[PDB]
Design a protein around this ligand. Structure first.
Ligand SMILES: Cc1nn(C2=[SH]c3ccccc3N2)c(O)c1[C@@H]1OC(=O)c2ccccc21
Ligand SMILES: [Zn+2]
Length: 357
DNA sequence: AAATTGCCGAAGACG
DNA sequence: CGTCTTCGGCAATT
């Protein structure tokens, strides 16, 4: 029954080839444009992130996430209040004379001027794309992405996300995050945390304004690794290993949410990352590969559902990397919303998920 | 050195 | 299920 639904969600290869071909051609053009003398954003390198590159994209290959990461040495972080996720950026010492001073505001490296330039360049370059139908969607407070809209003729969107790369140790609000010791283990956790961390120009919302110079932590790269390396056994989902249902559960919970979001705008606050964050916790709670045996798909999905209902009910979903940061705090998602989603989920759960049709 | 090449895992397609 | 395929990712090579 859930097998059937998964069959429908599964991406068709033909559809992937036509989408990738177009998406890739456009990104390499923008990446290439981004280099090339002049621009502040030279040494940017590409990192593909997102449901698609984690292989958990459903229904259609019509959403692509791309990080344009920039290595910036000698930066100091100041925690924006006690958010844990948001920061101000300064430099160790004076530039002499170097690219990113035209994004400063005194000593602070403002996310907003840096993003506005980045968007301006992307816009001038999309202007010149003649063989493909692509446009830049209008700006949005609360998003760090310059979003492309591609009609292939199918509608495809590409979020191009500027990122600052920092090679130093992770900020201490992450010190007790990534709790994978009993699952992926201590050597993996330590190795993961020796990788760089990234900041993206999503501004912290103070009230109903946005604090324009703040940046947000991003662990898209880390999350991408974990999806490709998700078992306690090294052979999970390999040719000489056992298939598990972890990813299948993530897709099912994704589908469920996205359907409810379609016909209910009481849910615009919710999103996929909530479901992703939740399943990460499930994977920590149930680290054994044997617990996610495909035979057990139904009970694994329902356990995920029960856990997600419990997060809603108790108004608490800890960020997986930054345990201070409550994604289900009253300030980000109002109580009323959380109860509405709870009743809809509970409804589908007890009625054999009619919305799956 | 910016662009090509080689290698192979993840997973779709098909019987 | 096995096998064959395309795509993504990576870094050695020119
Ligand atoms: C609510 C939400 N949070 N969210 C976060 S919170 C956060 C904290 C630290 C790092 C990433 C991050 N993403 C996120 O990606 C979302 C959804 O993804 C979005 O880009 C977005 C946009 C509007 C509503 C919800 C989301
Ligand atoms: Zn697995």
């Amino acid at each position: 029954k859930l097998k059937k639904v998964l069959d429908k969600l599964r991406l068709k290869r033909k559809d992937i080839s036509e989408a990738a071909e177009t998406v890739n051609k456009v990104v390499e053009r923008l990446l290439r444009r981004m280099q090339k003398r002049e621009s502040e954003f030279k040494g940017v390198e590409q990192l593909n992130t997102g449901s698609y590159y984690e292989h958990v994209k459903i229904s259609a290959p019509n959403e692509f996430d791309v990080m344009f990461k920039l290595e910036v040495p000698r930066i100091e972080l100041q925690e924006y209040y006690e958010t844990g996720a948001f920061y101000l950026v300064k430099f160790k010492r004076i530039p002499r004379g170097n690219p990113l001073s035209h994004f400063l505001e005194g000593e602070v490296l403002s996310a907003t001027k840096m993003l506005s330039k980045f968007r301006k360049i992307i816009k001038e370059e999309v202007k010149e794309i003649k063989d493909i139908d692509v446009s830049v969607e209008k700006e949005k407070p609360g998003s760090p992405a310059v979003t492309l809209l591609i009609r292939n003729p199918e509608e495809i969107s590409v979020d191009i996300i500027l990122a600052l790369e920092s090679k130093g140790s992770w900020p201490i609000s992450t010190k007790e995050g990534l709790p994978i010791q009993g699952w992926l283990g201590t050597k993996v956790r330590t190795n993961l945390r020796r990788e760089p961390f990234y900041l993206v120009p999503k501004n912290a919302k103070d009230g109903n304004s946005f604090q324009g110079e703040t940046w947000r932590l991003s662990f898209s790269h880390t999350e991408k690794y974990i999806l490709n390396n998700h078992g306690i056994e090294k052979t999970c989902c390999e040719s000489s290993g056992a298939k598990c249902c972890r990813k299948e559960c993530l897709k099912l919970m994704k589908y469920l949410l996205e359907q409810l979001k379609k016909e209910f705008q009481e849910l615009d606050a919710f999103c996929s990352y909530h479901v992703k964050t939740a399943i990460f916790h499930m994977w920590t709670q149930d680290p054994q590969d044997s617990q996610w045996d495909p035979r057990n798909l139904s009970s694994c999905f329902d356990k995920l559902l029960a856990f997600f209902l419990e997060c809603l009910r108790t108004e608490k979903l800890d960020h997986y990397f930054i345990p201070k940061f409550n994604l289900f705090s009253q300030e980000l998602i109002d109580r009323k919303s959380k109860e509405f989603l709870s009743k809809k989920i509970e409804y589908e759960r007890n009625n054999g998920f009619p919305i799956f049709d």
